[PDB]
Amino acid sequence: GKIQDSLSSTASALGKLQDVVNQNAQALNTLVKQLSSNFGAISSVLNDILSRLDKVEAEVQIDRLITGRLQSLQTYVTQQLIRAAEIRASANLAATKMSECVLGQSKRVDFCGKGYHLMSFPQSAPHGVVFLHVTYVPAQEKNFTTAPAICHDGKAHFPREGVFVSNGTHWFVTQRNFYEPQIITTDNTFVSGNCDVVIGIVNNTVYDPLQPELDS
Amino acid sequence: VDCTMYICGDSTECSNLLLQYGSFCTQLNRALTGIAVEQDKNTQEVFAQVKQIYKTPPIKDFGGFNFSQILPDPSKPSKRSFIEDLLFNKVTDLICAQKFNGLTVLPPLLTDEMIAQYTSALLAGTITSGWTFGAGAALQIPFAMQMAYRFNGIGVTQNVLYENQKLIANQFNSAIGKIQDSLSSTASALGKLQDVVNQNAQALNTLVKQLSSNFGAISSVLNDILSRLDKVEAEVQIDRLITGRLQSLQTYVTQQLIRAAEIRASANLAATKMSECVLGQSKRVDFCGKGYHLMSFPQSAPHGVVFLHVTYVPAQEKNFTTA
Amino acid sequence: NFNFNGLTGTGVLTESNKKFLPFQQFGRDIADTTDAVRDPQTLEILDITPCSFGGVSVITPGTNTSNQVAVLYQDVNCTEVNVFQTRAGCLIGAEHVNNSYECDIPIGAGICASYQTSQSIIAYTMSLGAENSVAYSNNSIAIPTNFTISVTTEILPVSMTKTS
Amino acid sequence: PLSETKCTLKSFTVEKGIYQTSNFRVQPTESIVRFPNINLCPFGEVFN
Ligand SMILES: *[C@@H]1O[C@H](CO)[C@@H](O[C@@H]2O[C@H](CO)[C@@H](O)[C@H](O)[C@H]2NC(C)=O)[C@H](O)[C@H]1NC(C)=O
Ligand SMILES: *[C@@H]1O[C@H](CO)[C@@H](O[C@@H]2O[C@H](CO)[C@@H](O)[C@H](O)[C@H]2NC(C)=O)[C@H](O)[C@H]1NC(C)=O
Ligand SMILES: *[C@@H]1O[C@H](CO)[C@@H](O[C@@H]2O[C@H](CO)[C@@H](O)[C@H](O)[C@H]2NC(C)=O)[C@H](O)[C@H]1NC(C)=O
Ligand SMILES: *[C@@H]1O[C@H](CO)[C@@H](O)[C@H](O)[C@H]1NC(C)=O
Ligand SMILES: *[C@@H]1O[C@H](CO)[C@@H](O)[C@H](O)[C@H]1NC(C)=O
Ligand SMILES: *[C@@H]1O[C@H](CO)[C@@H](O)[C@H](O)[C@H]1NC(C)=O
Ligand SMILES: *[C@@H]1O[C@H](CO)[C@@H](O)[C@H](O)[C@H]1NC(C)=O
Ligand SMILES: *[C@@H]1O[C@H](CO)[C@@H](O)[C@H](O)[C@H]1NC(C)=O
Ligand SMILES: *[C@@H]1O[C@H](CO)[C@@H](O)[C@H](O)[C@H]1NC(C)=O
């Protein structure tokens, strides 16, 4: 709903498109005005040079018309080629986003826009395309004491995915991009090395799923 | 460039003739402004992707990694990391000569000191906050617990770093050191930048020297044609100057357009790296430079940017029978 | 607008420390353009220089807001013209502000102008970003408890109007 | 210096942002003709 309010009053967000349409009609205009310029010849009307003079003179003048206009094309043309490539690269980027963002999920960061990317919805626009990027942005944070490792018996325990945290007493392992604390058991943690090497390992007890299951 | 002046110096006589070519004079400014505008858009896209300016904490404990090399130097008047000074010395009259004839060098919107604040921010958040500052509010995370992730990114289980940390510290630091001499002892590393700056100053020289060419006219001084000859005839002469010079601008302008379109492509490559490589961790093989990529450190350089890619390259092999 | 021994030119003649060889006449520069000259009647080494030149630039809020404008003379010293001297040139009609806000109308070299305060166009050193300092300690981590899902429009050209 | 912007913009509504309009060329105050120190025609040698 916010998108439609933005567009309702936003002329600028389409500036990229509106500029492209402009710049063409601009050079198109200027291309036309160049038909009114003398270019040094006695007039910018083709015939009015003729009927004024006997043609063996007009052959001279019409040069300065042709030499002028022919140039003004090659200016305009060479523009378009350059401008075409500018769109060309933009079109390649659109194909890349259309391919990767919409048809996939882009692991690339900030290629589909700020935040982790979920999906995109393309929308046509005159001489262009408009993606609606649906991105996952985290919000509320809480300062946590953390440790890279946890001793148990002298073995070291590291999280499979996520990190050991605590709110100051009970050590919890949680996934990284969302706060979802879970008690620390072997299914959370794998064993490597021992307690000497790690810098920052703390003293704790990693609960065991299996041990209670025995006791009967 | 001032089209009316560059073509016709201080002469209404020539200036009136220029009106008969119409919008050439104006459309050149419209052309160059399009360049000049997006240049500060390039520098905008690349460097400032970050909402806030982060700054490093007062005290540096990263687990042994020494960033005093790459972090802003608190004792310089313009705060720029020790490395960046090596760069600004390598890269480099043309100061007013061009500015005689209407060739002007406009100041880049962002002063170098500002560029060094961005590349401080991006580098301040990268160190403290991991990659999350590109996705939202920065999240302080222990740097040594950052590098446990960036190994999981490349498939090396984090238990390698928690055990090898001290070693990895030295390899990092000793790697940073050689970056100094890599820059310090050789001036060809910056050629890419150096080539850009030269080619710009190149064409300007050429564009200026075109003022001194006859182009078929009796002389290259616009007034001499007016001084020696009665106007009736001098009109035709000044054409060959104007036609020559006015063309000679379109040559220069077209070059800039083409050349800018290259930079425009290179700028996106940076903005792509800056976003993916610096702000995130790249899974694209050899996009961030040879090896598995861990993190990247942006560093500013004149009209350019320099990345320090910290990459993970395996070393010693042991033949194993496998199944 | 000077003529020296038949050499004509228009510039700002100043004293200069560059030292000719005695027989010489014109100093020059990389562009072959006349740079230094020697006063014949009493030998002295005079520099030369361009006039102020630069472009005029009209900084304005939208004509929808105000009809007031602040003129920027680019790359000049403020003589030959409420005035303020900048890095980018001589600015006129915008009150300097020691405060620093977001860059709004980009001017040059960090100077960015905005309309708000009665009101007058101002000019100030652009603050790049708002400032933050992450609170960082080797055991300190901040894990988000909640999220948003934002939809950010992104817009790209694809094709342009075909012509022949 | 404001009305020139409207002509450059070609729109009675000039939207926000900076516009290059014109150029100023400082004109020179006066001319220096500096021929060297000291000929003279021998009218003291002809007339006297
Ligand atoms: C940290 O979080 C743990 C997990 O909830 C808290 O432990 C619980 O605290 C509540 C307090 O209302 C008790 O009712 C539960 O019995 C506790 N459970 C366990 C397993 O300890 C702990 O109090 C929290 N500490 C802080 C400082 O926030
Ligand atoms: C965790 O527990 C271990 C013992 O299992 C502690 O190691 C000893 O700590 C005492 C002080 O309480 C020292 O006097 C001993 O010298 C330590 N061990 C040895 C062999 O020197 C450890 O300090 C506790 N804290 C940790 C490591 O998190
Ligand atoms: C990071 O490295 C810099 C130099 O690369 C260290 O600065 C040096 O500190 C020693 C102190 O033992 C001095 O003798 C040197 O003169 C310093 N050199 C420079 C260039 O400043 C700095 O101490 C290191 N810091 C950390 C945390 O590793
Ligand atoms: C975390 O601690 C810092 C210390 O300055 C504080 O500014 C911040 O607000 C704390 N986090 C939260 C969510 O309050
Ligand atoms: C973390 O830093 C503090 C300094 O504030 C220090 O006392 C402590 O030993 C450090 N711990 C580790 C694991 O580096
Ligand atoms: C593995 O065997 C091949 C056999 O040619 C040899 O080239 C290679 O060096 C061996 N690897 C090591 C680590 O020695
Ligand atoms: C622009 O001006 C028109 C009147 O010409 C007015 O109706 C409109 O509200 C104004 N919009 C803004 C954004 O100032
Ligand atoms: C302007 O001129 C004054 C003295 O006339 C001088 O102190 C100052 O540096 C000059 N500034 C520029 C930018 O030329
Ligand atoms: C900014 O403060 C200085 C004193 O530090 C003062 O001289 C100057 O006039 C102030 N600027 C403005 C625009 O008031």
Side-chain angles (χ1 to χ4, degrees), chain A, chain B, chain C residues 1-127 129-164, chain D:
Chain A
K2 291 178 179 177
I3 303 301
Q4 295 176 334
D5 302 344
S6 174
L7 299 176
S8 285
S9 63
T10 307
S12 62
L14 296 174
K16 294 178 178 179
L17 265 53
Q18 188 62 59
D19 181 67
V20 171
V21 176
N22 289 337
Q23 294 176 336
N24 296 338
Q26 184 63 59
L28 283 171
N29 283 333
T30 295
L31 176 60
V32 173
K33 288 179 178 178
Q34 294 299 104
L35 294 173
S36 66
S37 294
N38 293 335
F39 294 145
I42 62 173
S43 178
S44 63
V45 175
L46 179 62
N47 294 336
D48 288 343
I49 291 174
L50 296 175
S51 62
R52 180 179 182 272
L53 297 178
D54 290 345
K55 294 179 179 179
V56 176
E57 293 177 350
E59 301 297 319
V60 174
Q61 295 301 320
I62 294 172
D63 287 345
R64 291 184 181 176
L65 292 179
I66 296 172
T67 300
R69 292 183 181 175
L70 177 63
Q71 183 176 356
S72 178
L73 291 176
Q74 291 180 337
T75 297
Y76 171 77
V77 176
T78 299
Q79 291 303 321
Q80 298 296 99
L81 296 174
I82 296 168
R83 182 170 296 106
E86 182 179 3
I87 305 300
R88 181 70 190 98
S90 180
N92 279 343
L93 179 58
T96 302
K97 292 181 182 297
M98 186 66 71
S99 299
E100 300 178 352
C101 202
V102 170
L103 269 65
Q105 182 176 358
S106 177
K107 302 301 289 184
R108 302 175 66 183
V109 177
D110 287 344
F111 177 76
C112 293
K114 186 181 70 65
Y116 300 133
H117 177 265
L118 297 181
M119 78 197 91
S120 293
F121 295 149
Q123 296 299 323
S124 67
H127 302 295
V129 68
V130 171
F131 297 92
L132 300 177
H133 300 293
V134 177
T135 60
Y136 172 87
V137 174
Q140 298 177 336
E141 301 84 354
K142 294 177 181 176
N143 292 334
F144 291 145
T145 299
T146 182
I150 286 174
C151 288
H152 184 62
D153 296 346
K155 294 182 295 295
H157 295 291
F158 300 172
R160 284 179 178 81
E161 292 176 350
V163 282
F164 294 147
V165 299
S166 179
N167 53 346
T169 63
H170 297 76
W171 288 98
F172 294 158
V173 57
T174 187
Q175 58 184 18
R176 291 187 293 267
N177 291 280
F178 179 82
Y179 173 67
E180 184 180 3
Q182 294 177 335
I183 304 301
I184 297 170
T185 63
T186 60
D187 290 344
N188 294 335
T189 64
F190 63 87
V191 177
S192 178
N194 61 33
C195 285
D196 287 344
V197 182
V198 174
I199 298 169
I201 191 160
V202 295
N203 285 354
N204 213 0
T205 64
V206 173
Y207 175 76
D208 180 5
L210 181 63
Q211 184 63 59
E213 298 299 320
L214 268 65
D215 182 65
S216 178
Chain B
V1 176
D2 180 1
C3 51
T4 296
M5 177 171 175
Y6 173 79
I7 295 171
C8 304
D10 284 344
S11 174
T12 301
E13 299 82 355
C14 182
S15 179
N16 290 337
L17 292 174
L18 178 62
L19 300 177
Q20 296 175 336
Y21 295 134
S23 61
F24 289 157
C25 196
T26 61
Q27 67 178 16
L28 296 179
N29 288 337
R30 179 172 293 108
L32 293 176
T33 298
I35 294 171
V37 168
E38 65 183 344
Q39 296 300 318
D40 295 344
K41 181 178 179 180
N42 294 339
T43 301
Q44 186 62 58
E45 293 178 349
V46 180
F47 293 105
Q49 298 174 335
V50 61
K51 58 181 180 179
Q52 298 178 338
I53 294 300
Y54 303 94
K55 65 181 179 181
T56 59
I59 296 171
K60 311 290 186 293
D61 48 348
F62 292 144
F65 304 0
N66 186 344
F67 294 157
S68 68
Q69 296 297 325
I70 58 174
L71 284 177
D73 190 4
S75 298
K76 296 292 180 64
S78 176
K79 290 179 177 177
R80 294 175 302 190
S81 63
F82 176 82
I83 289 174
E84 294 178 351
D85 284 342
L86 300 175
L87 301 175
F88 293 157
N89 293 339
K90 303 298 182 179
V91 184
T92 61
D93 289 345
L94 312 169
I95 307 179
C96 289
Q98 292 177 335
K99 293 179 179 179
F100 297 163
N101 292 283
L103 276 65
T104 58
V105 173
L106 299 178
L109 171 63
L110 276 65
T111 56
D112 291 344
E113 182 179 3
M114 293 175 180
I115 306 302
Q117 290 182 337
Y118 287 136
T119 63
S120 175
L122 296 172
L123 176 56
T126 300
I127 297 167
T128 60
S129 64
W131 62 86
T132 60
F133 71 94
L139 304 181
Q140 68 279 4
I141 188 166
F143 190 88
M145 290 179 65
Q146 179 179 352
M147 292 302 292
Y149 306 153
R150 292 180 179 274
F151 282 170
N152 289 340
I154 62 172
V156 176
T157 297
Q158 59 188 21
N159 65 344
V160 169
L161 174 96
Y162 292 148
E163 294 180 351
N164 287 282
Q165 185 172 355
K166 297 302 289 185
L167 175 62
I168 298 171
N170 294 341
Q171 289 177 333
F172 179 85
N173 294 335
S174 297
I176 302 297
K178 294 177 179 177
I179 307 302
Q180 296 174 332
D181 300 347
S182 176
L183 299 171
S184 299
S185 62
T186 300
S188 65
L190 294 177
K192 293 180 178 178
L193 268 59
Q194 189 63 56
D195 181 68
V196 171
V197 177
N198 287 336
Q199 294 178 338
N200 294 338
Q202 183 61 57
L204 294 175
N205 284 339
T206 296
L207 180 61
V208 171
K209 293 177 179 176
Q210 296 299 102
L211 292 177
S212 63
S213 294
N214 294 337
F215 293 157
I218 63 171
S219 179
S220 67
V221 175
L222 179 62
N223 297 339
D224 287 344
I225 298 174
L226 295 174
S227 67
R228 183 176 76 189
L229 299 179
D230 288 343
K231 298 190 179 185
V232 186
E233 294 177 351
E235 300 302 321
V236 178
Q237 294 301 323
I238 294 172
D239 288 346
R240 293 183 185 174
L241 290 184
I242 294 174
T243 297
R245 293 180 182 173
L246 174 60
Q247 183 177 357
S248 178
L249 287 174
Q250 294 181 338
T251 296
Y252 170 75
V253 174
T254 299
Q255 295 301 320
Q256 300 293 96
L257 293 175
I258 296 170
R259 182 168 295 105
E262 178 180 2
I263 304 301
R264 180 68 182 93
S266 178
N268 290 337
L269 176 61
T272 300
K273 294 179 183 296
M274 184 67 74
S275 296
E276 300 181 353
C277 202
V278 173
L279 267 65
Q281 183 176 357
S282 177
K283 301 300 289 184
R284 301 173 65 185
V285 177
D286 291 348
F287 174 76
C288 290
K290 183 173 178 291
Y292 298 136
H293 176 275
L294 296 178
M295 80 198 99
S296 293
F297 295 146
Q299 294 300 324
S300 65
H303 305 294
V305 70
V306 167
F307 297 149
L308 300 177
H309 300 291
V310 176
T311 63
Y312 172 87
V313 176
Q316 298 174 336
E317 296 81 354
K318 291 179 179 177
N319 289 342
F320 291 148
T321 295
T322 184
Chain C
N1 186 340
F2 58 83
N3 187 342
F4 291 162
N5 297 340
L7 171 67
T8 57
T10 299
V12 175
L13 299 175
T14 70
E15 293 177 350
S16 60
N17 61 345
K18 292 178 178 178
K19 184 178 179 180
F20 287 178
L21 295 176
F23 61 98
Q24 286 168 330
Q25 188 58 58
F26 303 158
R28 287 188 186 274
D29 189 3
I30 306 302
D32 182 65
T33 59
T34 302
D35 175 71
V37 293
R38 184 186 63 196
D39 186 7
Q41 292 183 338
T42 179
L43 303 179
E44 62 185 344
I45 312 304
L46 301 177
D47 277 339
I48 300 171
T49 299
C51 308
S52 292
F53 295 145
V56 178
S57 296
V58 174
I59 296 168
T60 178
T63 60
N64 205 328
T65 299
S66 175
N67 291 338
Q68 186 175 358
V69 299
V71 174
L72 172 66
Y73 293 143
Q74 291 176 335
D75 188 5
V76 296
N77 198 333
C78 296
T79 52
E80 296 83 355
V81 180
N82 188 27
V83 176
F84 172 76
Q85 184 68 63
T86 66
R87 181 60 58 85
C90 190
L91 189 149
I92 288 172
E95 184 178 2
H96 183 203
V97 173
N98 279 336
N99 288 337
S100 64
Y101 302 137
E102 291 179 349
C103 185
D104 181 63
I105 295 172
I107 303 168
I111 304 302
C112 297
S114 64
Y115 175 71
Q116 66 178 19
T117 48
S118 66
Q119 288 171 328
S120 65
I121 296 170
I122 60 174
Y124 60 90
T125 299
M126 63 175 282
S127 292
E131 187 280 337
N132 183 344
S133 67
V134 178
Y136 173 75
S137 62
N138 47 344
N139 63 348
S140 176
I141 189 172
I143 291 171
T145 64
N146 194 336
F147 59 88
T148 187
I149 304 299
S150 66
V151 175
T152 62
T153 297
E154 186 179 6
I155 296 167
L156 297 170
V158 175
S159 63
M160 62 174 284
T161 299
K162 297 168 63 180
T163 57
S164 176
Chain D
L2 177 63
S3 301
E4 196 154 7
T5 323
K6 294 195 179 64
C7 314
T8 311
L9 188 147
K10 279 298 183 299
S11 172
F12 289 169
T13 296
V14 174
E15 66 283 4
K16 186 179 180 181
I18 183 171
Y19 296 91
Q20 183 170 353
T21 60
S22 176
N23 302 132
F24 62 93
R25 310 180 66 185
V26 177
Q27 294 304 323
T29 324
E30 63 185 342
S31 63
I32 307 296
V33 181
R34 264 307 193 84
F35 272 83
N37 218 5
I38 308 293
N39 291 318
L40 286 172
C41 294
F43 290 161
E45 296 180 354
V46 170
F47 295 153
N48 290 320

